[PDB]
């Protein structure tokens, strides 16, 4: 049964890049990475997973993480687990928001699974507060 | 991207030997790697996929190990039908990137080689150019010197040569050089000549023609 | 292998009404809706899941979600998965609360998958934001 | 194809000591209990997950967090920080699960910090994992 | 509820036939859709599920397509086994609606009756009412039509048909016409004919017996 | 922790009997229990584990029931090889505590013991010691009772016994037991006695003799 966990690349710290080549971190039973996307190796059933951390402290702070799908036609990318918040000026203490969702999704051989983020520069990379992770039923 | 270094370039050996060849990448990669064979002419075999995993109906002298990063493939006896360039390739980031091979030749027991000599057609004499011919059969190693002289002058640069591969049966090998020149300058000469240098004879072997 | 993924129908807005026939939303080998209600096809293990995503803009509001399993005995109901929010009246700015959950349950067949939700009205009625859904192990 | 889930025992509210021996708790296909610790029972591909609720009312801040640990090294971590003027009680909620490549006998267990805050009930904290 | 509406509501064909059954789901419904077939006095047995999926020992000719809203179950070669009334049914909610049926009867070349008279027992007559039957057996098509003649004065409301259903091997059917009057009126006549009308008969054939 | 408490301790049964030997669990356990097959000199034997489950290999007449903390192991037509003892052994928790253990022995009919007296030799009371045995031969059930009587003083804690296995032949018992004192209080007194109770015996036996 095909599986895959990622995680961050804490040597970014401006960018989100997925890995599976350490410890805690892997691809299983052929999936594999094309320009940091998850690419789902036969058609079938998957639980799709990911998990982010934000921290921190004029305007409203907009946090965001989704898990997509690439397709052919507009948009280009649609939406599968979406979540916001929005952090806000006058916080005298620091603060610290985290979404978590995964669900089951029927996918083809080739697809493409990628996360878009909102407020990069605020994840908080490590092994086990951010991740993208899927497997097949 | 990713670069995946095999070694050696080439290497070869007898019939039951076991060989082993490496691959080292330049990430860590998982243990997503691949394996394939390609005998000239034809498309690449999957023999392994992750790592060590053996693809259906690949024989089991065929296995592979590693993880991380240094890989290797592994044949425990080496059967005279498996000389090949064998790819390792990485299957974990796009694109797909494969190694730049490993020529696995098979080591046999020296072989002399046979020498005939073909003289030009008559139907290629019409066109204004001679060519003639000289083959070496089923001999090994692959090395071997071919000179050509005519009226014991010796020819330079107007011939070509071009070998088979190796037999999937008695791994040999065979040669054709190709000495090539003008109607007119083949009708000056009269001796065609062909002396063949190899391991296999202790004194080199001529063989020749006269028109 | 049984599996199913559950959507709210946008059309209702007063109600959360699972649906499984559009896109992004399955029934898979045995799985059937009775009643709002998701039936368990054969006796086995189950993985279960739901997301819901509340917002808004006297009185404090409670937000509160649940995968129940129907019971014949009282209260007829017994909790699976719970999560709630108590959003209070004086913020200067628009909130937003998401809950999600999921385990793996022993069911039998005929057992019948349901959620109670508090907060309707401020239901995110999206795929990507408010789904129920469960598979076979 | 093994599976468990655990969940808390209210009668300790000072500890939070897992077990799968009443309803809606289970071990199936070979997991088991050692010291509050799940026992992986063979080696291969496991989803794990957790989930806690913390609650309270309203002078030092209070530091929640619950991590899901390989018997140390964190697998799945989450923190909240609950400061003092808080005019009305507050409650949070931590939830997380994901896919990990464990051995025979590795041993799951669980740190959690804000214990005495902490929600027990069936549906509000548990912990468990399935092999894939 | 969901309602299905299944089309056309009977049909004939031949042995060797493609029948196509449609069937429409007053919603979408996914693949959730199952098809059944009975044969009369006999419980249903499953077909289809899925859709598509054809459930354990049911014979290829049996195929089921079709998703969202139209479905479709086709059987390629009709067999004279085949007839019964065949039912989709939707999976997806509750209750599980089936649609109203569609009846398959099976097309034959055409087979002449054979025609038998069977008097009132002398036990039956003691109890003051006379039953004469008539046979009609192994004919095809169902189309016959029986004459109850009373020394030549042919009777009206006083006899009561039944047709067996198509045999599963000759696909013939088979009528049995009960004519029924007091002993009052039996002691009355003296010769009971049975008069056959049909397709297989090139004239009229009447069995008769004296009293 | 958490105990096991198998019942009964032992059973005796005979070939083509159903036996149900019951595992009853301090805690609720879920199903995590297990069923072990001991004979002696030899190590366990997995039968079952999940409760329910049949280990590889373990024969049909086998299997487990029970769940929260009443189990059962029951042997369905008993077999001549399956005269052993059983464990049951929860698999819940750590330690994983096994039961007592219950024996299943063979049944056979009531066999009154025959009982023998050996005095002390003399070449023991050169040793300043004086073993005094008593032999119970033969007999069936197990459950025997031993009495000591020295000059009808009956004695309490200078006694050891012992046991065989049931005979390979008649299925009986057979029980020794050793009076051991000094060779001084030997010498105090005259008569020493053997006192036997058993199911087969109506009235206790006592053997006895005078140094």
Partial sequence: KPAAHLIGDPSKQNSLLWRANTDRAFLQDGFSLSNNSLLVPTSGIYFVYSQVVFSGKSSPLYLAHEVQLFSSQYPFHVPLLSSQKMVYPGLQEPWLHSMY????????????????????????????????????? | ??????????????????????????????????????????????????????????????????????????????????????????????????????????????????????????????????????????????????????????????????????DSKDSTYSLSSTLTLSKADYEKHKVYACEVTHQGLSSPVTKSFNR
């Fill in chain 2, 1 to 166: 991207d990713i670069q995946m270094t095999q070694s050696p370039s080439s290497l070869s050996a007898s019939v039951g030997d076991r060989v082993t060849i490496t691959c080292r990448a330049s990430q860590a990669v998982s243990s997503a790697v691949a394996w394939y064979q390609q005998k000239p002419g034809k498309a690449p075999k999957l023999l392994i996929y992750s790592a060590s995993h053996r693809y259906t109906g690949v024989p089991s002298r065929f296995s592979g190990s590693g993880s991380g990063t240094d890989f290797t493939l592994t044949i425990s006896s080496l059967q005279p039908e498996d000389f090949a360039t064998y790819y390792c390739q990485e299957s974990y980031s796009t694109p797909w990137t494969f190694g730049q091979g490993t020529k696995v030749e098979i080591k046999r027991t020296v072989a002399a080689p046979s020498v005939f000599i073909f003289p030009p057609s008559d139907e290629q004499l019409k066109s204004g150019t001679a060519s003639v011919v000289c083959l070496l059969n089923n001999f090994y190693p692959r090395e071997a010197k071919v000179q050509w002289k005519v009226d014991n002058a010796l020819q330079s640069g107007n011939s070509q040569e071009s070998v088979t591969e190796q």
């Fill in chain 1, 101 to 137: 969702h995964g669900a089951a999704f029927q996918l083809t051989q080739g697809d493409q699974l990628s996360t878009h983020t909102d407020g990069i520069p605020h994840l908080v990379l490590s092994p086990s507060t951010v991740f993208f992770g899927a497997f097949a039923l």
